[PDB]
Amino acid sequence: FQHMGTVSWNLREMLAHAEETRKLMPVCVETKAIVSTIQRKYKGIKIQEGVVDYGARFYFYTSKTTVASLINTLNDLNETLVTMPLGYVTHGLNLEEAARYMRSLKVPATVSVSSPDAVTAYNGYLT
C-alpha cells in the first residue's frame, strides 16, 4: 500500500495540513469534539452530509453509512485524504477491523492514529 501511510496527528495538525493542501478530510458528524472544533475554527460553516469546502475540505458522514459504503464513495471522489481509520470507534470497530476496511481504499491517504505505538499496531493489521 504505497498510497497510504500512517502518522499520529492530533486534530489541530490534521486541520492545519488539510487547510494548506485542500486534501479531503472525512469527519463523522456524530463525533462532538471534532464537530465542535470545526464549528469554532471556521465560523459560519454549514455542516451537512457530503463534501463541504469551507475553511478545510471536509467529507461529512454519519455512522449510519457503513464503512465499506463510505470507502466506495471516497474511492469514486478520487481525492487524496487526510483521515482517521474509518469505522474505528464510530462504528464500534476496533483498530484491526478498521484497518481491514481501509485495505479497500484506492485513493492516496494519510491515516492518523492516537499514538506512535498505534502507528506500528495499525500498519501491522493493515498488512
21 touches its own copies (CB under 8 A): yes
CB-wise, 17 or 41, nearer to its own copies? 17
Taking CB under 8 A as the criterion, the residue among 10, 13, 31, 37 binding its own copies is: 13
Taking CB under 8 A as the criterion, the residue among 11, 29, 35, 93 binding its own copies is: 93
Measured CA distances, 40 to 12, 32, 43, 90, 93 (Å): 12, 12, 6, 22, 29
115 touches its own copies (CB under 8 A): no
Measured CA distances, 73 to 12, 27, 58 (Å): 25, 14, 13
Residue list 73-92, contact with its own copies (CB under 8 A): 92
Task: Give the 3-state secondary structure of residue 21.
Answer: helix
Site residues for its own copies per CB under 8 A: 1-9, 13, 16-17, 20-21, 64-72, 92-94, 96-97, 100-101, 103-104, 106, 108-111, 116, 119, 123
